Symmetry: C5
Subunit: 327 residues, 5 copies
């Protein structure tokens, strides 16, 4: 906000009614009123002042701090003691640079009255949640904040996967509408890479959601148990779609390979025809007589009765190999 900010991207105190207020860098001195309003803090994991405040503030165990300030992580849920669970989520990387896969990683520390979220590269889901909040229809408690974040991450991953599916649909309909048209490589490769890199991170998030759906009594009240369950369902459906997409890509690749091999065989057949017709014919014409037509007026060759038997032999060979080429 006004003045320079150390590491705090979005400092927003909730309201308990979907509303809220931004607090900015002067948040160590907030006195939250009766416990309906949570407090949300979005931190830049790269800025060293963020890690500084994160080490000594809001009383996090040094184990926890070291657990969400790592470099490489995989999606997982982690409960540490009567409160304070840790969730490691993966965005979908709609950054101006590239690569929808290679998913941005979002790390959440969920308390009963605080949520602290970490990221390196900006996420869309967080801006969605923010504009949701100041619109007066956002979440109202910590569990609701985590649910909104997960919901938006999934609402974008499924959009991406449906886009991949329509891309494959266009490729296929083009390939089969035309004929002897190869599918555009360097696109099937990118789609395969994308499906693999998506599954690699979506497989553990489904389990995160399943775990968040089963009991999680005190933290994330079962009011949202079925919501977490249907998020689990949506990721299951998306993984099914990913496997179907991979199998469709493999079918396209096998079809293309078979096509080029059959075309190879066809051109080899034509090559054999061209040779076997002309190589002998160019040899038998070797001992042929005068190569100009009708030397003595009526009939060009004279004395042919001796050696003319050769034109029959190469003709027999030709028709033999021709029947030998057909079958």
């Amino acid at each position: 906000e006004s003045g320079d900010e150390r590491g705090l991207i979005y400092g927003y105190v909730l309201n308990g009614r979907g509303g809220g207020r931004r607090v900015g860098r002067n948040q160590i001195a907030v006195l939250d009123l009766l416990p309906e309003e949570s407090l949300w803090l979005h931190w830049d994991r790269g800025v060293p002042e963020a890690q500084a405040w994160l080490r000594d503030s809001a009383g996090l165990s040094e184990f926890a701090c070291d657990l969400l300030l790592e470099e490489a992580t995989r999606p997982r849920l982690l409960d540490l003691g009567a409160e304070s669970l840790l969730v490691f989520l993966r965005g979908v990387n709609l950054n101006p640079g590239a690569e929808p896969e290679d998913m941005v990683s979002l790390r959440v520390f969920a308390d009963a009255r605080r949520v602290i979220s970490l990221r390196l590269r900006p996420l869309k889901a967080v801006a969605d949640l923010l504009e949701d909040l100041e619109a007066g229809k956002g979440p109202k408690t910590a569990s609701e904040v985590v649910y909104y974040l997960a919901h938006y991450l999934t609402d974008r991953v499924d959009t991406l996967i449906s886009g991949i599916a329509d891309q494959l649909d266009a490729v296929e309909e083009l390939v089969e509408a035309d004929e002897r048209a190869s599918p555009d490589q360097h696109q099937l490769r990118t789609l395969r890479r994308r499906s693999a890199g998506l599954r690699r991170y979506l497989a553990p998030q489904r389990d995160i959601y399943s775990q968040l759906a089963r009991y999680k009594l005190s933290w994330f009240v079962e009011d949202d148990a079925d919501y977490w369950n249907e998020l689990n369902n949506r990721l299951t459906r998306n993984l099914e779609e990913l496997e179907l997409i991979r199998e469709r890509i493999s079918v396209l690749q096998e079809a293309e390979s078979r096509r080029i091999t059959e075309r190879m065989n066809r051109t080899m057949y034509l090559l054999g025809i061209i040779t076997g017709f002309f190589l002998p014919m160019s040899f038998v014409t070797g001992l042929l007589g005068i190569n100009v037509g009708g030397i003595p007026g009526a009939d060009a060759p004279h004395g042919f009765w001796l050696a003319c038997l050769l034109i029959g032999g190469v003709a027999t060979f030709q028709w033999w190999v021709f029947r030998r080429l057909r079958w």
Copy 2:
């Protein structure tokens, strides 16, 4: 019926004895008599008035309404509270357009005394159930309606799979009856696509049926537990048939690829023969004498004793490479 209908395809109050009656758009004022007769409503999921009535009528939780008015779904059973389970089923798409796979989706909300079914594209199973009903031999309670719908969906999926099997049988018997005959591509591809798209939706329905068969005490009385079990069995058998069909298609594809590769090798062999016979022979005839037979009457060549040794060398080379080509 008479007058214009908002979204209600089939409004049919059951009878408890297989009979029933159609009610039409004036159904908010039905007073069902003593509880033997259910009430069935088939809605068009696309018409906005259907979703309008569905939001505020028959007292469905907003969660439920939002759960069966989605766009993309996968087959699953869902129990929500002492009553009112939700089933998401997949037809087989016998629509005039195309594609037996890409299965029509049927979504059922089953109560103890009401069934509400949703669809976008028309389904055969529903017309089957209707003509069954007004024939006086249809279902008589809600569980029976859901069972009839599932039974008809399966009675058509197995017909489709047996059709696929006979198609593969015809293809194979043709291929092996003839010889060097390639199987009709663009048909093996469609059959493979069909098997994959069928399995993608049949794998969860088997689990739906298994779940509906295990306890489901209060809702779907165990009178039909064994019926749901045998529906589970039939889908298991059909999935086995689908895997067998996929493996048969893969065998046909490998056979065709091997055939074209071996034919490629054969035509390359013939090409090598044609060249290795004539390329040397066309070279040794280069320094040959007069290309017309018997110049000095008796014997055509003169002075051959010097350079005639060459015709032996290329002949040795020819028989060498010929023995080198055979083995």
Copy 3:
């Protein structure tokens, strides 16, 4: 027997001591004495009078009758109520027509004092059991009849699988005894089809036997529990042999494909040699002098000092490409 029979193939009342007696079509009026003797009925599932009697006689639930008069089934065991289990078994189809796989289906309804068996195509196991019975050493109770049927079905499936194994052994020993000999296709294909079609039905029968072996206290007394267990073992062993046979067939196929590809490469090498030796040599001889030896007695060419440098260039090219072909 004497007189015309409606649908009853083998009507044989057991004895409790392995013996028995045939009853024929007049069996509705048998009064079985003190309960040591069962009653066996082998029915033709196709004859409509068999299904007629089967609907209303021996008091079978209409669900049961409809369950074993289906068209397509998979092997499974099915218990229905304090008695009366249903077993669906698969023979091995030693019929004069064809196809050891595509196994004949045998459907058994086992009671405490009755066995009713159904089939379309004749089975060997049943004739085995019959000739066993009238020999005085057959079964003596219902469980024993079902066990004998299963035992004979397995005694024939393992014979078939061992035959397949010896066939593969002969094929392999021929292929490796000789060299550059392709395995007989259209036989590897049939063996692969046979293994697949056998496994498709043997996988559920193993589970049938396991289930029949675990408790089945009242029906099939544990006197035969270990016998059912060893039948389970034998089918497990046969499935292991089937997987081993499939892997051996795949090894043979890969060996053949590698062989034809390497032969293809070899003939391409020979083709390149034939061309690269003669194509240049046939070109350099183009500007060669008189193609007859020793024109001016001593040395054929005159004035060669100008253009004779060319015979070195094509020779350098030849030895270059020859060294380029070797490595």
Copy 4:
């Protein structure tokens, strides 16, 4: 021993202290003293007198006798009643004939005070155990005899697998030390066959050992429970090594196939070069002038200004296709 023996290979009464004594064919009249010494009998499963004595002696249930006198078996453990378990083990076939895989089968009937072992083809492990015994350091009870047999069978299977691994190591180091050197086929094939045939029988023995390790309280006192456990471990390690060996063989095969395909492409490239250089050049020289150098002293051709434009066209074609061949 002295006199002729019916079927008893090794008749050795143990001692309880690792020692013992051979008894020979006169063993029906041994009166074992206070129960520290077991009694071991190694029988030839082929000799009919062995099966004769085995049917009626040492009081084995006819079920048991029929269970270990079968023809085809798979490795399994089998407990039958308060005593008397049955183990079916597989040797490694170090017989002078051939085939380390195709493992000799050893069948053990273990009592609390008797061990009876059956075999067709001689086993090394048994001679090991014998020379161990008369050395004064052999087993002392029945469980110890079975453990020694299993221990020796494993000590030889792992030797064989390590030999396979070093063979693959030598093959690989040769292949990569040299270049364009194909791996010795007919050896990779034997190693693959060997790994498959070893796994086929080692997979169930691991389970035999695991079962023998879990409780087996009364029979095989838990004094050896951890020993059976580490035997389980050793077979697990050997199966891991077998899978690694199979994957290494597959890598070698793919490398060889890629190598021959790339060499095929290379020789095709050289063939295309040889033709495309000389086929046009041999055609343009067709209408060339006098093929001898310098006819009118200074410059050989006369009147070339009309048709000399052709030598440019085929040169353009040549450089075109040459650039078309490179890229």
Copy 5:
């Protein structure tokens, strides 16, 4: 230390506060004070005096001694009695020789107050732990020593796997940045070998860590239960990365094979073009007239009206096969 050492690499008595002291070969006479300080001994498994002392000292069961002085082992945890567990770990082999895979094996015997570690080839993790210790910030109890060893082994295995990933990234970005550039073989092969040899040993260590994380109450106090759990997590992540790396390598290999096959087809097409254009044209020029231009001034050929029809036939053939080659 000073004087010659028999087999003891690192003899270091801990301190209970991260500190400690080296003891050297005179350690049989240490009297550890009140039980906060453990005692660590790193032994060379090859030196026979190490195995000598290890057989009779620190009171290890002969079973244990024989269990960790084996030759071939796989990673596993092993508890033997109220104390004294055995862990078999695998380093990453950063030895000057070669092969990051083929991992050095570290074998630990963990007591409540003693740790005894064995190795053949030197390990980095142990030097790390040592320099950690004498820096005053090392472990302080036995469980902490085992945890530090495992932590360092993992901190190096993940470094190696990330290096493999960046190597593949460089290879891919090169391949796709350029075009028709083959990936560097003999590097993809080494990376595949490395991934396989890493997984072969990392799969059991993950289970070691999971087991060490679940209860292990008395030995390895649950103070480190979550630490062992996150070590389990890190190995799970690394195995995921290994599978992703293998799939990326397979994609690169398939892309290269497709590229060489398509280039093969392209050069075959060019070869067919070169022949089919010139082979006929070189034949029709056979009977062509004078090969010098304009013999009678105005028009070179005379009498062509008879046989000139041939130049049309070979031209028709040429354009036919050309259209036959395109499609």
